[PDB]
Amino acid sequence: TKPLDGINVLDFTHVQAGPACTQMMGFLGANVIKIERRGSGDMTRGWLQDKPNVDSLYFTMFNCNKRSIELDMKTPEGKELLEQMIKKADVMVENFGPGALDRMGFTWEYIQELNPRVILASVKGYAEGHANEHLKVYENVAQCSGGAAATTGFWDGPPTVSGAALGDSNSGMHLMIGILAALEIRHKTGRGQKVAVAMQDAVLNLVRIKLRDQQRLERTGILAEYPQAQPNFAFDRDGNPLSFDNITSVPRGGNAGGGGQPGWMLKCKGWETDADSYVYFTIAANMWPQICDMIDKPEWKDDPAYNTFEGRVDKLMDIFSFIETKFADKDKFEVTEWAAQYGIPCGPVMSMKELAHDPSLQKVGTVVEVVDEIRGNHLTVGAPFKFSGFQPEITRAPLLGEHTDEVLKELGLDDAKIKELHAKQVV
Amino acid sequence: TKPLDGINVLDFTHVQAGPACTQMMGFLGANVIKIERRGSGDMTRGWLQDKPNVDSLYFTMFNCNKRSIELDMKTPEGKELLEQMIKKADVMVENFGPGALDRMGFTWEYIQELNPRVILASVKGYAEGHANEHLKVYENVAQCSGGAAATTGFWDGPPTVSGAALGXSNSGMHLMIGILAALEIRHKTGRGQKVAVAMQDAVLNLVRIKLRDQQRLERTGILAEYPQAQPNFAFDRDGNPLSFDNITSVPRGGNAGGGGQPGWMLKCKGWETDADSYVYFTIAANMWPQICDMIDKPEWKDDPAYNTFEGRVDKLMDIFSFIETKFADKDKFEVTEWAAQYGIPCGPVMSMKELAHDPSLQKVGTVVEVVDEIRGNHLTVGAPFKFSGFQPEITRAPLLGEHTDEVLKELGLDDAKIKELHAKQVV
Ligand SMILES: *SCCNC(=O)CCNC(=O)[C@H](O)C(C)(C)COP(=O)(O)OP(=O)(O)OC[C@H]1O[C@@H](n2cnc3c(N)ncnc32)[C@H](O)[C@@H]1OP(=O)(O)O
Ligand SMILES: CC(C)(COP(=O)(O)OP(=O)(O)OC[C@H]1O[C@@H](n2cnc3c(N)ncnc32)[C@H](O)[C@@H]1OP(=O)(O)O)[C@@H](O)C(=O)NCCC(=O)NCCS
Ligand code: NA
């Protein structure tokens, strides 16, 4: 009834990349058992807490639909428990440092012996065989390693990190693809596989469009849709001109269109005192007559200086500046509604406050109120894929070690050894 | 064997989001038949060509491992051929405008009648049921609708788009999760499902950390790790010091950590003339003693105001300026190796130039040289998930209608029928 009903996940993950992956599997029906360090558990529990003595929203928004067991895996009893759990699992997921799981004694080769059907899934900073394969990597370092930082921001400013989790959550979603692919092939082979996603590679996959641009730049010496292609438009900090004459690596293009048709971020009424009073406005090559009507420039329709992409290259930023003057007395929603009349791709910069309280996102189950009696209810992002046959049933994140005894019971342990394990500080 | 060997994909997709999904399915073994507009095909073919009358890099980097057939789907004969192809398909994938495929007559209800096993997968701008469900959306419009633009860039600048394809390829990768999930459940039910991913929702999934911050902000009135919470560091337009006093929605934090571990983008030697001569340096709380050794100031090791997150919060950007002075005479790789010996989370900003020609990325199959005997070789991004059991075999992108007659012969049509369809301008 749900895609992953019956799929048993032995979940070693912590922080963001790994837990995002296993949470989303949980949302699609998977039985997720989260292994955590004794006493402290996943480090997100105590990071950026809003209330003293309560698991942070960092933890709760990444660990819904999971059960928690505490386990010291560097004890002989802990390793024995892992062997029993591995034999019951369909998928093992981890995002420890390079070699950490191996050093515990659970190499891929040994895992295969324990369970020929289990899939091992890993998130690492760099791919196996990479010069940097042994490095520990965090979110923004991964954005920097994968080309995003270099190609994000403005030509007269620094490399800029994205607010979106390009390093972590993005890598987790990519690992989910790997895991599901390994499940699909297991129906044929009856055998599990090892799958791994490097954070650098997940970032680079989303920056594919910039590898397109790098080759175009190498081949032709110019990127015509970039602001720097407009003569005497772009300048560095010290006032030096920036043209493609002297550019050999894909530059920062500010708010240019990327993989979309040419566009820009345009101010709307209240921009001086409202950080998000903007729209993104696209000048699509097949929409020039429509734009000319909207901005009352009929004389631009039949002028070759204006009516082709090629003609607009020397003046596109002038055109954006002029269009922007038309929005001076309208808010971003009024502008979006106006542009929509013309079928022009255009929308508001939604603030996080607006998104958190948007009726539409709650209607469609993308922003979800999680019922949590212990911590008070909270919002989370639900499943971004909608299915005809089912809806996720999101349930609160576990307290540390909440399901330890419950899980140990399922392994067949009678009450005697459970006391021992607690006594020995194994769980 | 590859995970999706034998999976037949009827591929209606165009531009970036849809084609990224079906290409990556192709990389994992799927049989992808791309349906294209007669004459012009997928709009990416003519989109920023580097050579006249040769398919662009936009096209080739998103359409490897596919066959191409031209089809006028508004003709009765075209619709007939689609019905035949649907009956042989496991997955249909589309990213036309809202209602477009329905208007062609291929509603989900009708598709189910044709083939109870087929999965229908769609990329949309906004989710079904959303107030904005009927809008057409490109890359950066989705970045703006999903909260990324509002929370990316600087406090004294505009909302800023990511160079990463948060709207397009990211939505495509999310759709791949949905499709694979639908294949999993089909093993149980014997029935296909409809799956859809909205570009807004794919963006919001990656911006989950900012929805965390919005709730923290609403609950507490402050985000202590953001630059706006540091005494007299960030300043507004009129030049006065920023604070959370009047901030009610998650602001832009420049190059801050985005998570529990603070960081910043620090200049290295050559930054004045090299836009990517930077490293990201993360001041992890647990790694502080290691940082004190590299900085060569043991005074702060035992100082209480310094060896704690609370001790640094008043003067965090002061010590980022000082650590940056250590790097003024060293390039980003020299600075990174200096920090690698301490296991410190520090990494360089990699340029697209460096990444395109990096030995490691080519060694691990993440940057791949495609052997294209028609157009000349090009680079692409390969599969970002690495598997123990197989490697992708990437094959060059198809010419427009290159496999039309080949596909029609597979449908059991003879040369008479084929010539009729060509003459009638159906293919
Ligand atoms: S989303 C952004 C985070 N990035 C990643 O997910 C990338 C992969 N993960 C990592 O690079 C690291 O895990 C990061 C996130 C950088 C954290 O680094 P740490 O310094 O915390 O190193 P480890 O995570 O590898 O953990 C250190 C040692 O602790 C052992 N360990 C973990 N949990 C347990 C339990 N429950 N019981 C006993 N030991 C445990 C690890 O196995 C590891 O062992 P070593 O062999 O000593 O490294
Ligand atoms: C990208 C997008 C904005 C482009 O819009 P567009 O250029 O107007 O193209 P559309 O997809 O709307 O298609 C236009 C029409 O041509 C038709 N068409 C497309 N291919 C055809 C073919 N081979 N034969 C006959 N008709 C065809 C469509 O069915 C549609 O018909 P309609 O008049 O009933 O609406 C739009 O496809 C879209 O909003 N896609 C969904 C979101 C998305 O994926 N965006 C792109 C991210 S990379
Ligand atoms: Na008008």
Short mmCIF file of C-alpha atoms in Angstrom, two decimals, chain B:
data_model
loop_
_atom_site.label_atom_id
_atom_site.label_comp_id
_atom_site.label_asym_id
_atom_site.label_seq_id
_atom_site.Cartn_x
_atom_site.Cartn_y
_atom_site.Cartn_z
CA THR B 1 23.14 -6.42 -15.33
CA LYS B 2 22.05 -2.84 -14.66
CA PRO B 3 19.19 -1.88 -12.30
CA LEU B 4 16.79 -0.64 -14.99
CA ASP B 5 17.68 -3.07 -17.81
CA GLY B 6 14.42 -3.98 -19.56
CA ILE B 7 12.52 -0.95 -18.23
CA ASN B 8 10.85 0.74 -21.20
CA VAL B 9 10.43 4.52 -20.88
CA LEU B 10 8.10 6.49 -23.15
CA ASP B 11 9.78 9.87 -22.79
CA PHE B 12 7.83 13.06 -23.65
CA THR B 13 10.23 15.31 -21.72
CA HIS B 14 11.96 18.49 -22.87
CA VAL B 15 14.24 21.25 -21.53
CA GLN B 16 16.03 20.15 -18.29
CA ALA B 17 13.98 18.72 -15.36
CA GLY B 18 12.28 15.90 -17.27
CA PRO B 19 15.21 15.01 -19.54
CA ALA B 20 17.63 14.86 -16.54
CA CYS B 21 15.34 12.22 -14.99
CA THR B 22 15.04 10.08 -18.13
CA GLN B 23 18.77 10.40 -18.97
CA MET B 24 19.78 9.19 -15.51
CA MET B 25 17.30 6.28 -15.89
CA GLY B 26 19.08 5.58 -19.21
CA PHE B 27 22.45 5.63 -17.41
CA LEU B 28 21.12 2.88 -15.10
CA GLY B 29 20.05 0.72 -18.07
CA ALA B 30 16.55 1.90 -19.03
CA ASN B 31 15.36 1.81 -22.64
CA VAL B 32 14.39 5.44 -23.29
CA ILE B 33 12.42 6.47 -26.38
CA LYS B 34 12.28 10.28 -26.59
CA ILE B 35 9.25 11.72 -28.42
CA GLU B 36 10.12 15.02 -30.10
CA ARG B 37 8.42 17.83 -32.00
CA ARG B 38 8.81 17.42 -35.79
CA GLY B 39 11.47 19.64 -37.38
CA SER B 40 12.74 21.46 -34.28
CA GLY B 41 12.54 18.71 -31.61
CA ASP B 42 13.35 19.41 -27.95
CA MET B 43 13.95 23.17 -27.68
CA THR B 44 17.41 22.52 -26.13
CA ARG B 45 18.73 21.35 -29.55
CA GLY B 46 18.82 24.93 -30.88
CA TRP B 47 19.43 26.54 -27.49
CA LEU B 48 22.81 28.36 -27.32
CA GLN B 49 24.53 26.21 -29.95
CA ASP B 50 28.34 26.43 -30.01
CA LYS B 51 28.35 25.40 -33.71
CA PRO B 52 25.76 26.31 -36.38
CA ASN B 53 23.29 23.50 -37.19
CA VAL B 54 24.82 21.17 -34.58
CA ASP B 55 22.84 20.13 -31.48
CA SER B 56 23.85 22.23 -28.48
CA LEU B 57 25.71 21.04 -25.38
CA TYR B 58 22.49 21.78 -23.45
CA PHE B 59 20.90 19.04 -25.55
CA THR B 60 23.76 16.50 -25.62
CA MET B 61 24.53 16.70 -21.86
CA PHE B 62 20.88 15.95 -20.99
CA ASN B 63 19.97 13.40 -23.74
CA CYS B 64 22.63 10.66 -23.83
CA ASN B 65 21.35 7.06 -23.65
CA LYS B 66 18.14 7.92 -25.54
CA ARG B 67 16.64 7.19 -28.94
CA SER B 68 14.73 9.92 -30.80
CA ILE B 69 11.46 9.72 -32.74
CA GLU B 70 9.65 12.71 -34.26
CA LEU B 71 5.86 12.72 -33.76
CA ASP B 72 2.98 15.13 -34.33
CA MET B 73 0.77 14.16 -31.39
CA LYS B 74 -2.11 16.42 -32.53
CA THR B 75 -2.74 14.06 -35.48
CA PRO B 76 -5.06 11.02 -35.18
CA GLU B 77 -2.28 8.72 -36.47
CA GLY B 78 0.17 10.14 -33.91
CA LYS B 79 -2.31 9.43 -31.10
CA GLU B 80 -2.71 5.87 -32.45
CA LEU B 81 1.06 5.30 -32.34
CA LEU B 82 1.19 6.65 -28.76
CA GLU B 83 -1.47 4.14 -27.66
CA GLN B 84 0.69 1.32 -29.10
CA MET B 85 3.84 2.66 -27.42
CA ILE B 86 2.05 3.14 -24.07
CA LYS B 87 1.06 -0.56 -24.12
CA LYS B 88 4.77 -1.48 -24.39
CA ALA B 89 5.93 1.05 -21.75
CA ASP B 90 6.72 0.63 -18.05
CA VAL B 91 6.99 4.40 -17.44
CA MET B 92 5.70 7.49 -19.26
CA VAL B 93 7.49 10.74 -18.32
CA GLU B 94 6.35 14.28 -19.19
CA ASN B 95 6.99 17.89 -18.26
CA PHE B 96 4.59 19.77 -20.52
CA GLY B 97 2.61 22.73 -19.19
CA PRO B 98 -0.37 22.11 -16.86
CA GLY B 99 -3.08 20.02 -18.55
CA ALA B 100 -1.17 19.62 -21.85
CA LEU B 101 -1.05 15.80 -21.91
CA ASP B 102 -4.69 15.65 -20.68
CA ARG B 103 -5.73 17.87 -23.61
CA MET B 104 -4.03 15.43 -26.01
CA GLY B 105 -6.54 12.85 -24.69
CA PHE B 106 -4.09 10.96 -22.47
CA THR B 107 -5.56 11.55 -19.02
CA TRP B 108 -4.45 9.20 -16.22
CA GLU B 109 -7.81 7.42 -16.38
CA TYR B 110 -7.34 6.69 -20.11
CA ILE B 111 -3.69 5.65 -19.68
CA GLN B 112 -4.76 3.11 -17.01
CA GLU B 113 -7.24 1.60 -19.48
CA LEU B 114 -4.53 1.28 -22.15
CA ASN B 115 -1.99 -0.30 -19.76
CA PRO B 116 -2.76 -1.14 -16.09
CA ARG B 117 0.97 -1.65 -15.38
CA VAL B 118 2.29 1.70 -16.72
CA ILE B 119 3.52 4.45 -14.38
CA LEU B 120 2.83 8.10 -15.30
CA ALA B 121 5.44 10.58 -13.99
CA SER B 122 5.21 14.38 -14.32
CA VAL B 123 7.23 17.46 -13.45
CA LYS B 124 5.01 20.46 -12.71
CA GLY B 125 5.77 24.01 -11.51
CA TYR B 126 3.35 23.90 -8.56
CA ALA B 127 1.60 20.83 -7.06
CA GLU B 128 -1.91 19.76 -8.11
CA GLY B 129 -4.41 21.61 -5.88
CA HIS B 130 -2.04 24.56 -5.31
CA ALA B 131 -3.47 28.09 -5.84
CA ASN B 132 -0.77 28.49 -8.52
CA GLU B 133 -1.17 25.03 -10.11
CA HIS B 134 -1.85 26.47 -13.59
CA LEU B 135 1.37 28.49 -13.97
CA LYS B 136 4.33 27.75 -16.25
CA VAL B 137 7.64 27.69 -14.35
CA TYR B 138 11.35 27.80 -15.31
CA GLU B 139 14.39 27.16 -13.06
CA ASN B 140 14.77 30.42 -11.12
CA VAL B 141 11.02 31.02 -10.75
CA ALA B 142 10.95 27.75 -8.75
CA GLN B 143 14.03 28.80 -6.76
CA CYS B 144 12.04 31.92 -5.82
CA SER B 145 8.75 30.08 -5.05
CA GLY B 146 10.49 27.44 -2.86
CA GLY B 147 12.33 29.75 -0.44
CA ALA B 148 15.90 29.37 -1.77
CA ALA B 149 16.23 32.86 -3.30
CA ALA B 150 14.91 34.58 -0.13
CA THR B 151 17.55 32.80 1.99
CA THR B 152 20.52 32.90 -0.43
CA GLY B 153 22.94 35.83 -0.81
CA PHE B 154 23.66 38.71 1.57
CA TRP B 155 21.63 40.78 4.02
CA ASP B 156 22.53 43.98 2.10
CA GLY B 157 21.84 42.51 -1.37
CA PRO B 158 18.92 41.02 -3.29
CA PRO B 159 17.47 37.52 -3.16
CA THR B 160 20.00 35.41 -5.09
CA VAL B 161 19.61 32.36 -7.31
CA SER B 162 21.88 29.32 -6.97
CA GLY B 163 24.06 28.27 -9.91
CA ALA B 164 22.91 24.74 -9.06
CA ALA B 165 19.74 23.66 -10.88
CA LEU B 166 17.56 23.61 -7.74
CA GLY B 167 14.46 24.07 -9.88
CA UNK B 168 15.23 21.85 -12.91
CA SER B 169 17.64 18.91 -12.47
CA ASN B 170 16.79 18.69 -8.74
CA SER B 171 13.10 18.25 -9.62
CA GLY B 172 14.17 15.61 -12.17
CA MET B 173 16.15 13.69 -9.55
CA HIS B 174 13.19 13.89 -7.14
CA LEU B 175 10.95 12.51 -9.91
CA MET B 176 13.37 9.59 -10.38
CA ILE B 177 12.84 8.73 -6.68
CA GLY B 178 9.06 8.77 -7.27
CA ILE B 179 9.30 6.56 -10.35
CA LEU B 180 11.58 4.00 -8.67
CA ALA B 181 9.23 4.02 -5.65
CA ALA B 182 6.32 3.31 -8.06
CA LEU B 183 8.27 0.39 -9.58
CA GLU B 184 8.80 -1.00 -6.06
CA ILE B 185 5.09 -0.98 -5.25
CA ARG B 186 4.18 -2.41 -8.68
CA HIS B 187 6.06 -5.60 -7.68
CA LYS B 188 3.45 -5.88 -4.89
CA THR B 189 0.26 -4.66 -6.58
CA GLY B 190 0.89 -5.44 -10.27
CA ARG B 191 -0.44 -1.93 -11.02
CA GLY B 192 1.14 1.34 -12.12
CA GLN B 193 0.59 4.63 -10.29
CA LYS B 194 0.65 8.32 -11.13
CA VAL B 195 3.55 10.23 -9.55
CA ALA B 196 4.23 13.96 -9.74
CA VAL B 197 6.87 16.34 -8.44
CA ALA B 198 6.36 20.10 -8.28
CA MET B 199 9.46 22.26 -8.80
CA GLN B 200 8.46 24.39 -5.77
CA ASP B 201 8.34 21.30 -3.57
CA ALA B 202 11.68 19.90 -4.79
CA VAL B 203 13.26 23.26 -3.94
CA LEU B 204 11.52 23.40 -0.51
CA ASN B 205 12.77 19.88 0.33
CA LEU B 206 16.36 21.16 -0.05
CA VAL B 207 15.42 24.31 1.94
CA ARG B 208 14.15 22.22 4.92
CA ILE B 209 16.92 23.74 7.10
CA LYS B 210 15.44 27.21 6.50
CA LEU B 211 11.96 26.03 7.56
CA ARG B 212 13.72 24.85 10.75
CA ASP B 213 15.14 28.37 11.13
CA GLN B 214 11.77 30.05 10.47
CA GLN B 215 10.22 28.12 13.38
CA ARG B 216 13.21 28.83 15.63
CA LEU B 217 12.85 32.54 14.74
CA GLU B 218 9.09 32.59 15.41
CA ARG B 219 9.59 30.71 18.70
CA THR B 220 12.60 32.62 20.11
CA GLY B 221 12.99 35.89 18.15
CA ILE B 222 16.65 35.15 17.31
CA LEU B 223 18.96 32.88 15.30
CA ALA B 224 22.19 33.11 17.30
CA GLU B 225 24.53 31.71 14.62
CA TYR B 226 23.40 34.14 11.88
CA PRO B 227 25.56 37.22 11.09
CA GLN B 228 22.68 39.52 12.16
CA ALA B 229 23.08 38.30 15.78
CA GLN B 230 26.77 39.33 15.99
CA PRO B 231 27.34 42.71 17.70
CA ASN B 232 27.96 45.43 15.08
CA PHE B 233 29.10 43.28 12.14
CA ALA B 234 26.34 43.36 9.53
CA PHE B 235 24.89 46.75 8.57
CA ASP B 236 21.72 47.76 6.70
CA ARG B 237 21.19 50.13 3.73
CA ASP B 238 21.32 53.31 5.85
CA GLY B 239 24.50 51.91 7.47
CA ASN B 240 23.17 50.98 10.94
CA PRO B 241 24.00 47.71 12.75
CA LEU B 242 21.74 44.72 12.06
CA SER B 243 19.85 42.73 14.68
CA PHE B 244 16.97 40.28 14.95
CA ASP B 245 14.85 42.96 16.73
CA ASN B 246 12.91 43.65 13.53
CA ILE B 247 13.52 40.41 11.58
CA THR B 248 10.47 38.09 11.41
CA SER B 249 11.39 35.91 8.40
CA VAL B 250 14.64 33.99 7.84
CA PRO B 251 17.17 36.47 6.35
CA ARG B 252 20.13 36.04 4.05
CA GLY B 253 23.30 35.13 5.98
CA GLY B 254 26.02 35.53 3.34
CA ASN B 255 28.58 32.74 3.71
CA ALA B 256 27.52 31.54 7.19
CA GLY B 257 27.45 27.77 7.96
CA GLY B 258 23.71 27.27 7.39
CA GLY B 259 23.88 24.67 10.19
CA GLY B 260 25.11 23.92 13.70
CA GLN B 261 28.79 24.50 12.82
CA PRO B 262 29.72 28.12 11.93
CA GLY B 263 31.88 28.92 8.90
CA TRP B 264 32.84 31.59 6.37
CA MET B 265 34.31 32.03 2.86
CA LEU B 266 37.93 33.16 3.25
CA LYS B 267 40.17 34.77 0.62
CA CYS B 268 43.38 33.03 -0.47
CA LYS B 269 46.36 34.26 -2.54
CA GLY B 270 45.27 35.67 -5.92
CA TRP B 271 41.65 36.46 -4.98
CA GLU B 272 41.96 39.95 -6.54
CA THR B 273 42.43 38.49 -10.06
CA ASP B 274 41.06 34.95 -9.49
CA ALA B 275 37.34 34.87 -8.65
CA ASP B 276 37.61 31.36 -7.15
CA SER B 277 40.75 31.75 -4.98
CA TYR B 278 38.91 31.01 -1.71
CA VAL B 279 38.41 28.28 0.87
CA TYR B 280 35.47 27.60 3.16
CA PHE B 281 36.59 27.28 6.77
CA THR B 282 34.31 25.74 9.40
CA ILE B 283 34.88 26.47 13.10
CA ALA B 284 33.48 23.20 14.48
CA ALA B 285 33.07 23.31 18.27
CA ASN B 286 34.64 19.85 18.74
CA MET B 287 37.58 20.77 16.44
CA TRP B 288 38.53 23.97 18.34
CA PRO B 289 41.77 22.63 19.92
CA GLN B 290 42.92 21.50 16.45
CA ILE B 291 42.17 25.02 15.10
CA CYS B 292 44.16 26.66 17.93
CA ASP B 293 47.23 24.63 16.89
CA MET B 294 47.02 25.72 13.21
CA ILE B 295 46.28 29.36 14.10
CA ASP B 296 49.22 29.18 16.53
CA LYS B 297 47.46 30.96 19.39
CA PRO B 298 47.14 28.65 22.45
CA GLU B 299 45.76 31.56 24.55
CA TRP B 300 42.22 30.78 23.34
CA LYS B 301 42.46 27.03 24.15
CA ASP B 302 42.01 27.60 27.90
CA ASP B 303 40.15 30.93 27.58
CA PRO B 304 36.45 30.36 28.45
CA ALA B 305 35.07 33.06 26.09
CA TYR B 306 36.70 31.34 23.08
CA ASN B 307 36.53 27.52 23.43
CA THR B 308 32.70 27.52 23.41
CA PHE B 309 30.04 28.45 20.82
CA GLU B 310 28.71 31.03 23.31
CA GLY B 311 32.23 32.43 23.85
CA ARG B 312 32.74 33.00 20.11
CA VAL B 313 29.24 34.31 19.22
CA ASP B 314 30.10 37.92 20.20
CA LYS B 315 33.35 37.96 18.16
CA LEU B 316 33.04 35.18 15.56
CA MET B 317 33.66 37.38 12.49
CA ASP B 318 36.66 38.97 14.23
CA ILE B 319 38.51 35.62 14.35
CA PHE B 320 37.40 34.78 10.78
CA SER B 321 39.20 37.97 9.69
CA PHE B 322 42.31 36.87 11.62
CA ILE B 323 42.34 33.31 10.25
CA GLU B 324 41.99 34.85 6.76
CA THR B 325 45.24 36.80 7.29
CA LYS B 326 47.09 33.47 7.71
CA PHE B 327 45.97 32.52 4.15
CA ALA B 328 46.96 35.78 2.37
CA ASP B 329 50.20 34.30 0.95
CA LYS B 330 48.99 30.74 0.23
CA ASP B 331 46.76 29.40 -2.56
CA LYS B 332 43.55 27.53 -1.76
CA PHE B 333 45.21 24.09 -2.06
CA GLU B 334 48.13 25.14 0.17
CA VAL B 335 45.65 26.46 2.76
CA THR B 336 43.56 23.25 2.52
CA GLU B 337 46.53 20.87 3.01
CA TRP B 338 47.59 22.96 6.01
CA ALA B 339 44.17 22.19 7.57
CA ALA B 340 44.01 18.54 6.41
CA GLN B 341 46.82 17.53 8.79
CA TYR B 342 44.54 18.60 11.68
CA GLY B 343 41.43 16.94 10.15
CA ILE B 344 39.85 20.41 10.09
CA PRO B 345 36.77 20.93 7.89
CA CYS B 346 38.35 23.22 5.28
CA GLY B 347 38.12 22.98 1.48
CA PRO B 348 38.78 25.03 -1.65
CA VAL B 349 36.32 26.73 -3.98
CA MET B 350 36.70 24.60 -7.11
CA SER B 351 36.32 26.48 -10.41
CA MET B 352 34.37 24.93 -13.30
CA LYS B 353 37.68 25.02 -15.23
CA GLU B 354 39.35 22.88 -12.54
CA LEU B 355 36.39 20.47 -12.20
CA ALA B 356 35.98 19.93 -15.97
CA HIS B 357 39.59 18.71 -16.20
CA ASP B 358 40.14 17.22 -12.74
CA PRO B 359 41.87 13.77 -12.91
CA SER B 360 39.99 12.33 -9.90
CA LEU B 361 36.48 13.11 -11.19
CA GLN B 362 37.28 11.42 -14.51
CA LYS B 363 38.86 8.43 -12.72
CA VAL B 364 35.66 7.77 -10.71
CA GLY B 365 33.32 8.21 -13.72
CA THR B 366 31.70 11.41 -12.42
CA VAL B 367 33.00 13.61 -15.24
CA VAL B 368 32.81 11.48 -18.40
CA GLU B 369 34.11 12.01 -21.93
CA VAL B 370 31.32 10.97 -24.31
CA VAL B 371 32.46 9.43 -27.60
CA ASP B 372 30.32 11.30 -30.12
CA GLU B 373 31.45 10.43 -33.65
CA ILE B 374 28.90 12.79 -35.25
CA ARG B 375 29.48 16.02 -33.30
CA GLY B 376 32.89 15.46 -31.71
CA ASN B 377 33.47 14.37 -28.11
CA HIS B 378 32.10 16.29 -25.15
CA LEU B 379 32.20 16.06 -21.36
CA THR B 380 29.17 15.29 -19.23
CA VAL B 381 28.30 14.47 -15.64
CA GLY B 382 27.92 10.70 -15.13
CA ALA B 383 26.01 8.77 -12.49
CA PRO B 384 26.63 10.36 -9.05
CA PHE B 385 25.75 7.03 -7.35
CA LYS B 386 28.44 4.36 -7.57
CA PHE B 387 27.45 0.67 -7.47
CA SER B 388 29.47 -2.47 -6.66
CA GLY B 389 27.77 -4.51 -9.39
CA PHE B 390 27.98 -2.27 -12.46
CA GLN B 391 29.14 0.90 -14.22
CA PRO B 392 27.08 3.11 -16.59
CA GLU B 393 27.90 2.93 -20.30
CA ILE B 394 27.13 6.43 -21.56
CA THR B 395 26.29 6.70 -25.27
CA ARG B 396 25.98 9.85 -27.41
CA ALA B 397 22.77 11.84 -27.76
CA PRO B 398 20.46 11.04 -30.72
CA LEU B 399 20.00 13.15 -33.85
CA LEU B 400 16.44 14.42 -34.35
CA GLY B 401 14.28 11.50 -35.52
CA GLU B 402 17.37 9.28 -35.86
CA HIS B 403 15.46 6.24 -34.57
CA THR B 404 11.98 7.06 -35.93
CA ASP B 405 11.77 4.26 -38.52
CA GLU B 406 13.64 1.90 -36.18
CA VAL B 407 10.99 2.51 -33.47
CA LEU B 408 8.10 2.21 -35.95
CA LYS B 409 9.45 -1.13 -37.21
CA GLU B 410 9.44 -2.32 -33.57
CA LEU B 411 5.71 -1.46 -33.50
CA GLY B 412 5.19 -3.95 -36.37
CA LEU B 413 4.74 -1.37 -39.12
CA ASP B 414 5.93 -2.17 -42.66
CA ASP B 415 7.66 0.15 -45.16
CA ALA B 416 4.33 1.14 -46.75
CA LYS B 417 2.85 2.35 -43.45
CA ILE B 418 6.13 4.12 -42.54
CA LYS B 419 6.30 6.03 -45.84
CA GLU B 420 2.63 7.04 -45.41
CA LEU B 421 3.34 8.51 -41.94
CA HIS B 422 6.34 10.43 -43.33
CA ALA B 423 4.30 11.76 -46.28
CA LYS B 424 1.36 12.72 -44.04
CA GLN B 425 3.85 14.53 -41.74
CA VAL B 426 2.95 12.49 -38.65
CA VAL B 427 6.63 11.61 -38.17
#
